[PDB]
Design a protein around this ligand. Structure first.
Ligand SMILES: CCCCCCCCCCCCCCCCCC(=O)OC[C@H](COP(=O)([O-])OCC(O)COP(=O)([O-])OC[C@@H](COC(=O)CCCCCCCCCCCCCCCCC)OC(=O)CCCCCCCCCCCCCCCCC)OC(=O)CCCCCCCCCCCCCCCCC
Ligand SMILES: CCCCCCCCCCCCCCCCCC(=O)OC[C@H](COP(=O)([O-])OCC[N+](C)(C)C)OC(=O)CCCCCCCCCCCCCCCCC
Ligand SMILES: CCCCCCCCCCCCCCCCCC(=O)OC[C@H](COP(=O)([O-])OCC[N+](C)(C)C)OC(=O)CCCCCCCCCCCCCCCCC
Ligand SMILES: CCCCCCCCCCCCCCCCCC(=O)OC[C@H](COP(=O)([O-])OCC[N+](C)(C)C)OC(=O)CCCCCCCCCCCCCCCCC
Ligand SMILES: CCCCCCCCCCCCCCCCCC(=O)OC[C@H](COP(=O)([O-])OCC[N+](C)(C)C)OC(=O)CCCCCCCCCCCCCCCCC
Ligand SMILES: CCCCCCCCCCCCCCCCCC(=O)OC[C@H](COP(=O)([O-])OCC[N+](C)(C)C)OC(=O)CCCCCCCCCCCCCCCCC
Ligand SMILES: CCCCCCCCCCCCCCCCCC(=O)OC[C@H](COP(=O)([O-])OCC[N+](C)(C)C)OC(=O)CCCCCCCCCCCCCCCCC
Ligand SMILES: CCCCCCCCCCCCCCCCCC(=O)OC[C@H](COP(=O)(O)OCCN)OC(=O)CCCCCCCCCCCCCCCCC
Ligand SMILES: CCCCCCCCCCCCCCCCCC(=O)OC[C@H](COP(=O)(O)OCCN)OC(=O)CCCCCCCCCCCCCCCCC
Ligand SMILES: CCCCCCCCCCCC(=O)OC[C@H](COP(=O)(O)OCC[N+](C)(C)C)OC(=O)CCCCCCCCCCC
Ligand code: SF4
Ligand code: SF4
Ligand code: SF4
Lengths: 378, 176, 156, 315, 97, 70, 102
């Protein structure tokens, strides 16, 4: 057969028989940076920014996974307002990831116009990030114990104004793709996964719901305040790229539904756990109280000690089940931090999903898995 | 709760089959796509006229690191190394000694701006608001060595941007 | 007039053309590529300066190294640079490409892309905002405007 | 006076091509919520000049080619034939008034497929040659519908002369009686010219000119963009005929030009709206959708004049 | 009619910039010929304008000075030429110039 | 705004207008103010050659009326 | 004579642009660089186009053929040729000849 080394950050070594794909062998590691080994040399607060940079399209959903794991070991609970902010920006982040997933997928197979319409919406959502953290992408805003700062006055009104119009933006995306026969030809019956294969290959997220499996960690194993919001889980029926595209577009509509409830049900209170041995005190009291300055000093040099133990904490990140197996030895630095990137199991199944398809279908299959190589390689 | 995205049966009554035949032969749904992009042609573009117009920012924006002073001109930094100990990228290098008048001040304060991840942890950890991230985001250089700031560059930034750093801190110090 | 004056106007014309048609080849390796995509998005619309969104490497005039350059990827990046027709410029975007950034002390990260290829503009940030990258492209255009290729040739 | 006439044809074609790149980049920009080139010159009018100068002073890219003579022949053939397809066009008076003008344009466009084929050979890249074979297969496939569709429209005109299409449409555009053919003719010109949604040669992650960069690449680009205008001018003469007043020829040219620009703009309009076909899917469009309908409509358009007593004149 | 008063705005931009020379200067220096309210001028010669009927992002802009610190900036303008006091107002970190 | 696309379209239109305007005016300049004679079939060519001989000058676009008849 | 002079100009102009485009770049004097398996489906599409092309050659003279007094004979032969061209397409279609899956 013909062997093609589609070099670059992905290197596909395919074995083509005519126009069909007989074997796809992804070569990864072109973005492997040793994140897991670096985390062992950092305190728990110092390792938080490393998680913005794994799935760098869903930055504030990666922080939440790490924060839930450290909080579980710490045996603390973030305050209720901090949990609504974490569920509000979890869904804003899911809109960010699903815009990048659908439109980049569309741009790969030719449709270049929806990318520019929706990346203006991403630009406005990057402003919400920058008004709570000061950074457009790598906020480092969700932390063990809550969030760094409180929402500035006027943000929630600006989130409301953005959310009113966003359904119309999705409807314009659907006027270009959903019924367009050319798009349906590129996605329908492409990359079919049986529900039993999807479970055994470690798939998660819409890679399961696209095959009809009724599973969503936000509803089966809820975290923060997802048990207090009402939304629907879109389920596919054919297991193909088209159904996975409709699940993602429908999840954006449900994210707007959740954002509508977070804005109304946002409670008052503080935004980080009122325990100064875990969360630093306010600067006003760090400059007046002896205890506060001691605890500020030691939380920013040594860090908080975490009891010995090991947790596997997972969330329903936009890409899929994102989790961390975090091992504490009692000190202020993690002993082990294994990162479970959902795309790692998905991309491992590209070979199976590409059997019996043409070379141009491999581009559509990689798009439907929603692969970002920050998390695949870590 | 859940919903089905693609679990509908197309009608087989003659009218519906002919409605689908018209769509296939007369390209009706491909012509809605043309209508949706003709709409955008007559919408005003979202482009701004950079560099004469700038993208909006907030007082929390994290930009170029800078070293500040008290209203008397005395440096705020008292060489405590909390910023150095918390920098995730290990980008701060500090050395200190007793100044000529007995004060506790740095003889070295370097930031490798190519190691820095612009995270703002240093300005969180400083008890005297000495090191901050100013609002500047236009300091691209032509050589790698211009991004290795020493204490003079950082003090120059503070004198250069104090008028704007002070007003950004005044607008946001009550949230921190 | 003097020969320098005549050959200085031709220098301006070719300098003007080259900075008005900067076609970039973006090595999108990590998160800094998202901000590169935001510079092409409507708000900044890099295509209005003449900077096409994405050109093929053999048609490209500038290479934007936007992300972490790992040892495994280093030889690939050099090969693309060696195949760029001249004149060719490199823009280092973000801390990872500048000096390794957050992963400077890693066993599998090149400590700055300027160990593999020569760099013309360094753009600081993690990531630089789309406006900061645009400010760096407009600085590369100003750097092309100051070239004196024909003056050096004339005075040789 | 004839040599002046040729230059009054060649030069404006290349300037029309030059500023079609600008118009394409702005039109896509405004459909994409952008602005497009608006810095280099006022409203971007100097952007085409900047690109031209830049390309023609960039370092040559030519690697080792096995048929260097074939490397130079492909751009010459592509650009020589692209200009040669303009000489019979009535606008309203043709440069070369041919009795068989329609056949002449089919013949010349069936030779431009050699430029694709020769460039694939002269690239010394087994993966560039595969790309050229796909590009050739698509082009010749859609030449079948162009000839049969064109033959069906001439059975109402009565001759292969391009100027007789003006007379045939003096009462009514041929699109009204032949809109089914116009629909397929129009899409064939897209596939023939390798434009979106049929530009699988630009499947970056999914061209044969890669071995050309700057210089010769600029010439292939001009040939391709010159054919888009020519095809859309051919479409206007064939299905949107303009009234010709012998005493005011310039009235024809204004109306004829406006039609040919709108059709050219619609090519940009289409490129901004759709994803692209797989290679097999654009073949199945031709062999299993267009060809069955084109053959059926050729039978109908041979018999229709006979059964209505509407056979056109031979002269 | 709205069609006519669109052309009124087009002409009033020529006069709003001080004539044809001023209209051309702003067209070629800044690629924009909009007219806004003058908010202030800094000690380096940069003029700052405002138009709150424009959408957020284009409602504030600076026309850079033609000479700053002994450098000819007629064609060479830089985003870093904005002094810190106006930098805050130009990037919408505040509402008060 | 969308009307900023028009200046580029205007240049294309003028460039595409020249070929058809130039041909019309050059034909009338070269053929005594008349359209260029169309001869697609050999009968039309025979008459054009007959006009060239009748012209007195060797040009077929010079017509002779009822003034060469006695 | 006009057509001969028209073709000469177009290819001479194209030839001049090609050579200068190859040589005009070669004055910057840049630094020295110092640096298929046969598919039977591509052949079948090329052959099928040829046989359809030869049928199109026989159909091209139809505009002239409709000016004859034997219209009953001409229309029969014209429809016979087009129909036989459809039969070829039907035959290749049913024999999996138009497919691209291996
Ligand atoms: C093609 C069909 C004819 C085009 C006519 C376009 C036109 O007149 O626009 C008016 C107007 C444009 O208004 P709009 O796009 O809806 O919104 C713009 C704002 O209202 C108002 O926007 P504004 O406040 O920013 O107004 C600023 C504008 C003032 O408004 C205009 O200048 C528009 C006039 C353009 C003509 O000033 C300028 O920008 C002057 C430069 C204009 C660009 C150069 C256009 C010339 C192209 C022709 C080149 C030579 C041939 O057209 C209409 O809305 C209705 C008529 C459109 C069909 C034309 C029927 C005749
Ligand atoms: C609109 C139509 C567009 C098509 C026409 C495009 C015309 C554009 C103007 C061309 C002007 C000539 C510029 C040639 C490139 C100059 C250059 O790159 O300088 C670097 C070169 C190199 O200079 P160098 O010799 O010092 O380089 C030495 C260093 N190494 C070893 C690394 C190369 O300069 C020249 O060689 C100048 C060439 C001679 C002067 C050319 C003037 C000709 C003008 C008429 C044509
Ligand atoms: C390099 C060229 C590459 C090929 C492109 C050029 C095509 C050449 C054929 C052009 C003539 C034609 O086919 O149209 C007939 C056209 C059809 O016109 P017509 O059928 O309407 O008749 C014209 C005269 N009336 C109408 C009065 C009867 O013939 C002419 O217009 C002029 C008469 C023929 C005289 C010119 C022929 C010269 C020889 C040309 C071939 C030279 C060899 C070229 C080698 C090519 C290598 C690939
Ligand atoms: C008494 C009357 C007797 C004579 C009547 C003769 C006519 C009768 C009516 C015939 C039906 C009309 C035929 C139309 C052509 C159908 C072609 C076809 O096969 O379509 C299905 C084809 C294929 O449809 P499909 O992909 O969904 O699949 C069909 C077959 N199955 C389902 C089995 C797989 O669709 C297309 O052709 C779309 C091609 C892509 C188009 C992208 C560009 C769109 C641009 C839109 C603008 C076009 C404007 C055109 C105007 C130009 C003006 C100059
Ligand atoms: C959707 C994708 C494909 C869309 C292609 C759209 C572009 C094709 C052109 C469609 C609009 C028709 C051309 C209008 C502009 C022509 C201006 C003009 O020639 O004068 C008016 C022309 C008059 O010129 P005329 O010569 O065509 O009118 C006489 C027509 N005959 C010869 C039959 C007697 O009339 C129109 O164009 C009216 C258009 C209304 C229908 C649209
Ligand atoms: C509408 C499109 C019109 C396009 C053609 C306009 C004519 C070209 C004028 C180009 C002048 C560019 C210029 O020097 O700056 C503008 C000038 C600016 O005026 P100025 O006062 O700055 O003149 C000095 C210019 N420098 C600094 C370069 C020496 O205004 C004019 O247009 C004067 C004519
Ligand atoms: C009609 C179709 C043709 C287009 C003509 C109409 C448009 C012409 C606009 C007027 C152009 C005059 C220059 C504009 C005024 C000006 O000085 O602007 C300065 C501008 C700005 O210079 P800048 O690049 O330093 O400015 C950067 C910052 N901004 C853009 C924000 C101001 O530069 C130029 O305009 C230089 C234009 C060079 C023209 C080169 C012509 C080459 C001739 C053909 C090649 C011949 C060799 C072969
Ligand atoms: C056509 C008009 C028509 O058929 O009237 C509708 C009538 C009622 O049928 P209905 O109740 O709607 O549901 C189908 C039940 N057989 O329909 C009927 O009852 C008639 C029987 C329905 C089946 C008819 C199938 C014929 C389809 C052949 C193709 C027709 C188009 C041919 C021309 C193509 C070019 C346009
Ligand atoms: C008005 C009243 C109704 C009129 C009569 C209508 C009934 C005739 C239409 C029947 C349809 C043709 C038979 C058929 O259904 O075949 C479909 C089949 C499709 O298969 P395929 O595309 O490969 O994909 C399958 C995926 N499951 O494809 C096939 O099986 C092969 C089909 C080959 C036939 C098409 C090729 C010939 C086209 C020539 C068109 C001109 C007509 C021929 C001349 C007729 C003379 C009178
Ligand atoms: C006779 C030899 C042929 C070349 C003729 C000169 C063309 C090159 C100059 C334009 C680029 C330029 O100069 O850039 C833009 C300039 C301003 O440049 P600046 O910032 O003042 O330059 C600073 C000094 N530098 C450049 C060394 C760093 O805008 C102008 O006012 C130019 C607009 C008028 C251009 C008219 C062109 C007419 C020639 C057409 C046929 C070639
Ligand atoms: S912003 Fe972050 S990376 Fe930069 S110096 Fe401060 S702590 Fe270090
Ligand atoms: S900048 Fe602040 S935290 Fe760092 S050494 Fe000085 S006083 Fe301590
Ligand atoms: S510099 Fe920052 S944003 Fe850019 S690739 Fe590295 S970690 Fe990501």
């Amino acid at each position: 057969n013909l062997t093609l080394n589609f070099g670059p950050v992905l290197r596909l070594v395919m074995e083509l028989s005519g126009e069909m794909v007989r074997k796809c062998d992804p070569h990864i590691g072109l973005l492997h940076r040793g994140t897991e080994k670096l985390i062992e040399y950092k305190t728990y607060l110092q390792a938080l920014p490393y998680f913005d940079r794994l799935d760098y399209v869903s930055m504030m959903c990666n922080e939440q996974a790490y924060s839930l794991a450290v909080e579980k070991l710490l045996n603390i609970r973030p305050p209720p307002r901090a949990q609504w902010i974490r569920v509000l920006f979890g869904e804003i982040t899911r809109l960010l990831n699903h815009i990048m997933a659908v439109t980049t997928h569309a741009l790969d197979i030719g449709a270049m116009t929806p990318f520019f319409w929706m990346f203006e919406e991403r630009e406005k959502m990057f402003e919400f990030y920058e008004r709570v953290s000061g950074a457009r992408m790598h906020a480092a805003y969700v932390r063990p114990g809550g969030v760094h700062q409180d929402l500035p006055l006027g943000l929630m009104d600006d989130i409301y104004e953005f959310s009113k119009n966003f359904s119309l933006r999705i409807d314009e995306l659907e006027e270009m793709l959903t019924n367009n026969r050319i798009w349906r030809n590129r996605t329908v019956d492409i990359g079919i996964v049986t529900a039993e294969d999807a479970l055994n290959y470690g798939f998660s997220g819409v890679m399961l719901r696209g095959s009809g499996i009724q599973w969503d960690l936000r509803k089966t194993q809820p975290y923060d305040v997802y048990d207090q919001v009402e939304f629907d889980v879109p389920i596919g029926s054919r297991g193909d790229c088209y159904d996975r595209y409709l699940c993602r577009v429908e999840e954006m509509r449900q994210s707007i539904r959740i954002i509508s409830q977070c804005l109304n049900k946002m409670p008052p209170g503080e935004i980080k756990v009122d325990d100064a041995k875990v969360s630093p005190p306010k600067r006003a009291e760090m400059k007046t109280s002896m205890e506060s300055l001691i605890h500020h000093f030691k939380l920013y040099t040594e860090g908080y000690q975490v009891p010995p133990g090991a947790t596997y904490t997972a969330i329903e990140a936009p890409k899929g089940e994102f989790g961390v197996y975090l091992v504490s030895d009692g000190s202020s630095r993690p002993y082990r931090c294994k990162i479970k990137a959902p795309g790692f199991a998905h991309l491992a199944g590209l070979d199976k999903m590409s059997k019996g398809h043409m070379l141009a279908d491999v581009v559509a299959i990689i798009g439907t898995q929603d692969i970002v190589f920050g998390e695949v390689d870590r | 709760t859940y919903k089905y995205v693609n679990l509908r049966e197309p009608s087989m009554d003659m009218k519906s089959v002919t409605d689908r035949a018209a769509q296939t032969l007369l390209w009706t749904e491909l012509i809605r796509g043309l209508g949706m992009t003709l709409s955008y042609l007559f919408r005003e573009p979202a482009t701004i006229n950079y560099p004469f117009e700038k993208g909006p920012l907030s007082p929390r924006f994290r930009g170029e690191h800078a070293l500040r002073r008290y209203p008397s001109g005395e440096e705020r930094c008292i060489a405590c190394k909390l910023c150095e100990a918390v920098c995730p990228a290990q980008a701060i290098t500090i050395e200190a000694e007793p100044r000529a008048d007995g004060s506790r001040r740095t003889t070295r304060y370097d930031i490798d701006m190519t190691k820095c991840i612009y995270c703002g942890f240093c300005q969180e950890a400083c008890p005297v608001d000495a090191i901050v991230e100013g609002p500047n985001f236009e300091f691209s250089t032509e050589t790698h060595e211009e991004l290795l700031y020493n204490k003079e560059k950082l003090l120059n930034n503070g004198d250069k941007w104090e008028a704007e750093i002070a007003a950004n801190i005044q607008a946001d110090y009550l949230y921190r | 007039s003097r020969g320098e004056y005549v050959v200085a106007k031709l220098d301006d014309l070719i300098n003007w053309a080259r900075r008005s048609s900067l076609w970039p080849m973006t090595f999108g390796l990590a998160c800094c590529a998202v901000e590169m995509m935001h510079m092409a998005a409507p708000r900044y619309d890099m295509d209005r300066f003449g900077v096409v969104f994405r050109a093929s490497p053999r048609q490209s005039d500038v290479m934007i190294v936007a992300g972490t350059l790992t040892n495994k990827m280093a030889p690939a990046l050099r090969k693309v640079y060696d195949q760029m027709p001249e004149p060719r410029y490199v823009v280092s975007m973000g801390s990872c490409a500048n000096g390794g950034g957050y992963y400077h002390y890693s066993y599998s990260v090149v400590r700055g892309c300027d160990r593999i290829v020569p760099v013309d503009i360094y753009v600081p940030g993690c990531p630089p905002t789309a406006e900061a990258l645009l400010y760096g492209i407009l600085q590369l255009q100003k750097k092309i405007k100051r070239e004196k290729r024909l003056r050096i040739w004339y005075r040789r | 006076m004839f040599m002046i006439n040729i230059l009054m044809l060649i030069i404006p074609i290349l300037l029309a091509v030059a500023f079609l790149t600008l118009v394409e980049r702005k039109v896509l920009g405004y459909m994409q919520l952008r602005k497009g080139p608006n810095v280099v010159g006022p409203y971007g009018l100097l952007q085409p000049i900047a690109d031209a100068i830049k390309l023609f002073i960039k370092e040559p890219l030519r690697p080792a080619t096995s048929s260097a003579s074939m490397f130079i022949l492909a751009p010459i053939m592509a650009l020589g034939l692209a200009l040669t397809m303009w000489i019979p066009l009535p606008m309203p008076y043709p440069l070369i008034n041919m009795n068989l003008g329609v056949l002449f344009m089919l013949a010349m466009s069936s030779l431009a497929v050699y430029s694709i084929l020769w460039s694939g050979w002269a690239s010394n890249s087994k993966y560039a040659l595969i790309g050229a074979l796909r590009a050739v297969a698509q082009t010749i496939s859609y030449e079948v519908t162009l000839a049969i569709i064109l033959l069906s429209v001439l059975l109402m005109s009565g001759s292969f002369t391009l100027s007789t299409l003006i007379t045939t449409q003096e009462q009514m555009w041929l699109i009204l009686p032949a809109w089914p053919l116009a629909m397929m003719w129009f899409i064939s010109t897209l596939a023939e010219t390798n434009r979106a949604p049929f530009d699988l040669t630009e499947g970056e992650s999914e061209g044969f000119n890669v071995e050309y960069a700057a210089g010769p690449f600029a010439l292939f680009f001009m040939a391709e963009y010159a054919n888009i205008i020519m095809m859309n001018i051919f479409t206007a003469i064939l299905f949107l005929g303009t009234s010709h007043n012998p005493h005011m020829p310039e009235l024809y040219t204004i109306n004829f030009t406006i039609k040919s620009l709108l059709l050219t703009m619609s090519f940009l309009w289409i490129r901004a709206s759709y994803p692209r076909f797989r290679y097999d899917q654009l073949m199945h469009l031709l062999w299993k959708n267009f060809l069955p309908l084109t053959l059926a409509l050729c039978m109908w358009h041979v018999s229709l004049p006979i059964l209505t007593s509407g056979i056109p004149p031979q002269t | 009619m709205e069609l006519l008063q669109v052309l009124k705005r087009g002409l009033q931009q020529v006069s709003g910039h001080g004539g044809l020379r001023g209209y051309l200067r702003v067209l070629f220096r800044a690629n924009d010929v909009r007219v806004g309210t003058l908010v202030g001028e800094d000690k380096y010669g940069n003029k700052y304008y405002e138009d709150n009927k424009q959408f957020f992002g284009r409602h504030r802009w600076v026309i850079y000075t033609t000479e700053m610190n002994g450098k000819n900036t007629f064609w060479d303008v830089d985003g870093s030429m904005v002094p810190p006091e106006w930098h805050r107002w130009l990037h919408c970190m505040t509402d008060d110039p | 705004m969308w009307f900023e696309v028009l200046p580029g379209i205007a240049v294309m239109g003028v460039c595409l207008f020249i070929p058809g305007m130039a041909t019309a005016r050059i034909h009338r300049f070269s053929n005594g103010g008349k359209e260029k004679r169309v001869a697609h079939y050999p009968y039309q060519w025979y008459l054009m050659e007959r006009d060239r001989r009748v012209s007195g000058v060797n040009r077929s676009y010079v017509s002779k009326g009822l003034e060469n008849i006695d | 004579m006009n057509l001969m002079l028209a073709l000469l100009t177009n290819f001479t102009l194209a030839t001049l642009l090609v050579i200068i485009a190859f040589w005009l770049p070669q004055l910057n004097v840049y630094s020295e660089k110092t640096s298929l398996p046969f598919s039977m489906k591509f052949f079948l599409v090329a052959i099928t186009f040829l046989l359809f092309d030869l049928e199109i050659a026989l159909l091209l003279p139809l505009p002239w053929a409709s000016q004859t007094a034997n219209l009953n004979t001409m229309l029969t032969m014209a429809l016979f040729l087009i129909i036989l061209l459809a039969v070829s397409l039907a035959y290749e279609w049913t024999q999996k000849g138009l497919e691209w899956t291996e």
